[PDB]
RNA sequence: GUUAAUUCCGAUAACGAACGAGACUCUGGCAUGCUAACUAGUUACGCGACCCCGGUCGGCGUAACUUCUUAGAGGGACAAGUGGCGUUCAGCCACCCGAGAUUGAGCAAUAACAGGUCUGUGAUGCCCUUAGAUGUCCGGGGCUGCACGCGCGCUACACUGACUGGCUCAGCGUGUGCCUACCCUACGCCGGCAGGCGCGGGUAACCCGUUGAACCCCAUUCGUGAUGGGGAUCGGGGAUUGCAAUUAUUCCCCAUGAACGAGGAAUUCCCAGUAAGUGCGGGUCAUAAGCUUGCGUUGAUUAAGUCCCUGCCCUUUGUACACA
């Protein structure tokens, strides 16, 4: 009934609000980026990992079923 | 440190039951501190053995239900420690001390019960068990045929059922099980 | 000189009243005696059906035979051997001598 | 230093690999890239570097317990055979994937047939397993 | 209708149609002299604090 | 149900008549005074005898019975 | 990267049967059939081609060499147990088809089962289980 | 020096583990490998508990080493647990006074008490007419 | 009055008794107390291999020991001690101490069904055939047949998950046949695999085996898509047993990829290692587990009450019922 046409590839715009706003929000996970951004789960997966490498976002608690990233620290 | 415990992380004190009814049968201080929400047992033999178990286990007891989850105490230990850090990372207090104020605001006073249906107020050990039992299986729907993940869904109900924002599974049977009881009394 | 005796029998109490006796018969002529080994048992589970047609409720049998061996090691020749074992010995015990 | 004991066996297989990658000798068969592991599997492996990755998780296992066969690689690298309709079993793993090993362990001398058959591991090969398990204990702390 | 606070001082028996009630013999903390008789749902020990919505329904004795 | 039957009760009855001076006060010294003046063919039912015989120990320095 | 690539490529029609870009390139070509999951694997494997990215950024001229693998599988040495048709019934080649010559290559062995009038034939002319299942309790939707 | 050996043993539902005490150094390990590093490492506090909730002062004097064998993942942990704790309590026992050994032991009675006495909880046997040891089959009417 | 109990106490025209229940047999659990172990291990000695005195090794031979392995004799638990309730009798609740302060199964009374079995019998009354046999044996088919309904079951409907790797653990057992022509397996090669070929071990605490089980744990891919869920249907090929597989005996590979989005009326089983999940032995087996019988792993929510329903056991009552 209800079909889920998520977004394969990031947008000009898409990259640049995840660029932005994303290290605002106080939790990043892909369960909920792939459902905020109208993502694909393997885009939010994919999207994580160069914003550790980049540093704005930190990583705590990593698993296989399950990864969490935050903002940077606040000083 | 033989004098405190940790859970994991979190403080063994500074857990405050807000409701003077559900202190005694809430277990999460000075005396049922663990490292983990696993143990060995042997809390379901007597009738009022049930209420010194520490509530961490009690939740983590009463996840694995609906099948195919049923007997894995190992993986829903993990289902719990990682949403400890969800609740730490959207409010960013105590998650011992959300999960206390869930099962008050999530625990109906009275139910109806047939005997025309009469209203009769529910014990304090009933309250607590039946506030677990609604924010449980709201996860188990939240996660169900959904992309948001069963770790995120424990943390989402049990804060909103904390604040009451009658957005969890758990406020909103709460709600109606005491407005029928409300009705036919 | 490195004789093994098995010792098996069906009843518990016919393998032990046996297993001692031949303690008391080598320890009279007082040679070298090792204890009797104390072997895991072997039983026999059989499960049937009690109905002789296939009609009624499903009910099942426990026909059981528990088989316990014992080994006592002595180290003599053959000749003092053959003369203790013929000596008080029961059909429920069957007895078999290794003289390697 | 340390034994492998007090090395984690999770990040072991690819550090063991990653001595295979140096020496790059271990004379491959022709289908590695194209092989079913076994006949529980249905797929292919997603690491394309299965078989040193394998090899070097079998040096890991000789070196516990000697002695081990053809058919004792099999069964411990077998699995649930999820039969579909049917009840799942326990499986068996495909016997020349592990037989290849074994012969690729013996092309490059990292392990001897221990009498009364079987594969051991040889000392040498004990060795310079030491080194990466102290590599591995030095970069944790 | 505040919310009030009553406290098990005694337990008098199982009640309902499955047994499924206890009616228990009920003191309030708000004060100890009035006191009323409810039927609990639930098993219930001696020296434990109910929450009724109202105090001035009372449960009849079997 | 932790009730004694009659075969436990009547054997315990004979034992207190006869035996007055043998008989103590704890478990376990009457257990093994009953073992030898009795033949009991099963430690379970030695235990339950010398047991209601405990009981009713308390019974005999209280007053009489029946 | 991360970013979307130029040259999009949503819709891949290919040998007749769309191929989306949405999928992965691992499992997009399971469309077609005649492959599957396990065959479309080891066709990334006989060219080196990456298989982690999608199927809507792989460029033009190296899809003709994954096409090409597909109906002629024996020149880049696939091995004879990888294909559907086995020792074929006319000209026994050892050969994959590839959704198009697939039916065509499924309706002659069935009427050349009912010339023949053998059993497993005659099973299919009813449109009865011709693997010998149980038609007493199952096989009810399909037949009112 | 002496040989201050002591060798106990911890039972589980099937799972097994002796721990072999020693005078020697503050070292802890299990089937050579030590009490850190075990998978599931779902339970990883749960081997610390005889080793925070007692110190590690305690186990400085003393090394273990246990040998562990059947039943199954859980109950190997469980098996070791409670074998270490009662490793100490023995140690303590037999070569200084109890004074020491009994306020280490009411620590390990106040937290939990299968540390020292093993629960005898074990699967019964399964009866005819039914898949489990209680639960039936589907009885079927008419 | 009490109990799981016609279990006892106590009354008493009833007394003395008998079967049954209980008692009794097996199993579980606690004893660094006894006996014992070179087909079981532990601890020490001496080496070997490796790493920087120490640490590991199912790598090697020795002396002590039963803590871990086994089975034998004994012991231990009795409402025994305490606080209450109770005629203070029968007994009941809670607590200390203690591995247990109700483990599970076996056996099971009088009478009855016209319950089922003559297709278990060289168990059989009576009736029937008996030479062109309803007797023996051989070839093929069938009992599986398919517009439909019903019963016991296995697999799913997924993200608590599917997939790919790596990590890591069990106990019941069983195994070479009087006829019998047919065993379980180590190890070394060939093939992706099914499987094929060589040598040995084990009549079994010896070999499988230290039973390298699933489950579990860790790390990728997928991204809510009837999707890498799901595997029904079906095509092509390759192997085993058998004299013989087509109506596909089974096993292996590729391919086809249906319904099914948590299931109405109604209904089944269960409260402690229990349910549920999950695998392993045995039976039928030449070829063989969706069944059944046991074992083992992970492992709970709920309840410690009731006659509301379904029923069962006594007492009173009424009956025009007595194949009730």
Redesign the interface.
Same mark, same amino acid.
């Given at each position: 009934r209800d079909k889920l046409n998520n977004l394969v590839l990031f947008d000009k715009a898409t990259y640049d609000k995840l660029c932005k706003e994303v290290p605002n929000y106080k939790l990043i996970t892909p369960a909920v980026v792939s459902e905020r951004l109208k993502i694909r789960g393997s885009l939010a997966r994919a999207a994580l990992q160069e914003l550790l490498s980049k540093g704005l976002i930190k990583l705590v608690s990593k698993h296989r079923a399950q990864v969490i990233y935050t903002r940077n620290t606040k000083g | 440190t033989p004098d405190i415990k940790l859970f994991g992380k979190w403080s063994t004190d500074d857990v405050q039951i807000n409701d003077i009814s559900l202190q005694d049968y809430i277990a999460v201080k000075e005396k049922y501190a663990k490292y983990l929400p696993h143990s060995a047992g042997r809390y379901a033999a007597k009738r009022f053995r049930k209420a010194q178990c520490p509530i961490v286990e009690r939740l983590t007891n009463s996840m694995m239900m609906h099948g195919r989850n049923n007997g894995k105490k190992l993986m829903t230990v993990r289902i719990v420690k990682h949403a400890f850090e969800i609740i730490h990372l959207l409010t960013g207090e105590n998650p011992l001390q959300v999960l206390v104020n869930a099962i008050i605001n999530s625990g109906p006073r009275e139910d109806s019960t047939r005997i025309r249906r009469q209203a009769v107020d529910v014990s304090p050990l009933r309250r607590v068990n039946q506030a677990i039992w609604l924010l449980c299986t709201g996860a188990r729907e939240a996660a169900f045929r959904n992309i948001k993940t069963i770790a995120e869904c424990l943390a989402d109900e049990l804060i909103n059922a904390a604040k009451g924002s009658s957005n969890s599974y758990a406020i909103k049977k709460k709600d109606e099980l005491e407005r029928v009881a409300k009705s036919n009394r | 000189h490195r004789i093994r005796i098995t010792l098996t029998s069906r009843n518990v109490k016919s393998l032990e009243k046996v297993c001692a006796d031949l303690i008391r018969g080598a320890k009279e002529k007082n040679l070298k005696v090792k204890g009797p080994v104390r072997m895991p048992t072997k039983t026999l589970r059989i %499960?049937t059906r009690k109905t002789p047609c296939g009609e009624g409720?499903? %009910?099942?049998d426990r026909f059981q035979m528990r088989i316990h061996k014992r080994l006592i090691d002595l180290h003599s020749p053959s000749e003092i051997v053959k003369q203790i074992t013929s000596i008080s010995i029961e059909p429920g015990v069957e007895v078999e001598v290794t003289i390697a | 230093g340390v034994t492998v004991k007090d090395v984690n066996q999770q990040e072991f297989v690819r550090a063991l690999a990653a001595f295979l990658k140096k020496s790059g000798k271990l004379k491959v068969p022709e289908w590695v890239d194209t092989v079913k592991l076994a006949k529980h599997k249905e797929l292919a492996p997603y690491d394309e570097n299965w078989f040193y990755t394998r090899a070097a998780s079998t040096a890991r296992h000789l070196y516990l317990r000697g002695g081990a066969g053809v058919g004792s690689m099999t069964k411990i690298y077998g699995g649930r055979q999820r039969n579909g309709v049917m009840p799942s079993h326990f499986s068996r793993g495909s016997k020349s994937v592990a037989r290849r090993v074994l012969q690729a362990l013996e092309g490059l001398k990292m392990v001897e047939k221990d009498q009364d058959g079987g594969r051991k591991l040889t000392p040498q090969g004990q060795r310079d397993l030491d080194r990466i398990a102290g590599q591995v204990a030095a970069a944790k702390k | 209708q505040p919310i009030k606070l009553a406290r098990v001082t005694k337990v008098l028996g199982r009640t309902g149609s499955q047994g499924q009630c206890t009616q228990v013999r009920v003191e309030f903390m708000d004060d100890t002299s009035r006191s009323i008789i409810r039927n609990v749902k639930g098993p219930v020990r001696e020296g434990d604090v109910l929450t009724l919505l109202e105090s001035e329904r009372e449960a009849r004795r079997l | 149900g932790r009730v004694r039957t009659k075969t436990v009760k009547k054997a315990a009855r004979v034992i207190i008549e006869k035996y007055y001076t043998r008989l103590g006060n704890d478990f376990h010294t009457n257990k093994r005074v009953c073992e030898e003046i009795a033949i009991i063919p099963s430690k379970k039912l030695r235990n339950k005898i010398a047991g209601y015989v405990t009981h009713l120990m308390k019974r005999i320095q209280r007053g009489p019975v029946r | 990267s991360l970013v979307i690539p130029e040259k999009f490529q949503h819709i891949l029609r290919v040998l007749n049967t769309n191929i989306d870009g949405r999928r992965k390139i691992a499992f997009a070509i399971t469309a077609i059939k005649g492959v599957g999951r396990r065959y479309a694997h080891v066709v990334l494997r006989k060219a080196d081609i990456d298989l982690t990215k999608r199927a809507g950024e792989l460029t033009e001229d190296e899809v003709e060499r994954v096409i090409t693998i597909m109906q002629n599988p024996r020149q880049y040495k696939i091995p004879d147990w990888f294909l559907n048709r086995q020792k074929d019934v006319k000209d026994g080649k050892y050969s994959q088809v590839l959704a198009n010559g697939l039916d065509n290559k499924l309706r002659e062995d069935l009427e050349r089962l009912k010339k023949i009038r053998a059993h497993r034939g005659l099973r299919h002319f009813w449109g009865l289980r011709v693997r010998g299942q149980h038609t007493k309790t199952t096989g009810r939707r399909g037949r009112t | 020096g002496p040989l201050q050996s002591v060798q106990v043993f911890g039972r589980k539902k099937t799972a097994t583990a002796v721990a072999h005490c020693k005078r020697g150094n503050g070292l802890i390990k299990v089937n050579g490998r030590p009490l850190e590093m075990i998978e599931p490492r779902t339970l990883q506090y749960k081997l610390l508990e005889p080793v925070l909730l007692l110190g590690k002062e305690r186990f400085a004097g003393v090394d273990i080493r246990v040998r562990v064998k059947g039943g199954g993942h859980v109950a190997q942990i469980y098996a070791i647990r409670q074998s270490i704790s009662k490793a100490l309590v023995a140690y303590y026992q037999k070569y200084v006074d109890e004074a020491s050994k009994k306020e280490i032991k009411d620590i390990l009675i106040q937290y939990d008490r299968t540390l020292l006495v093993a629960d005898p909880r074990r699967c019964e046997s399964k009866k005819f007419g039914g898949p489990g040891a209680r639960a039936r089959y589907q009885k079927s009417y008419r």
């Open positions: - | - | %499960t409720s499903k %009910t099942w | - | - | - | - | -």
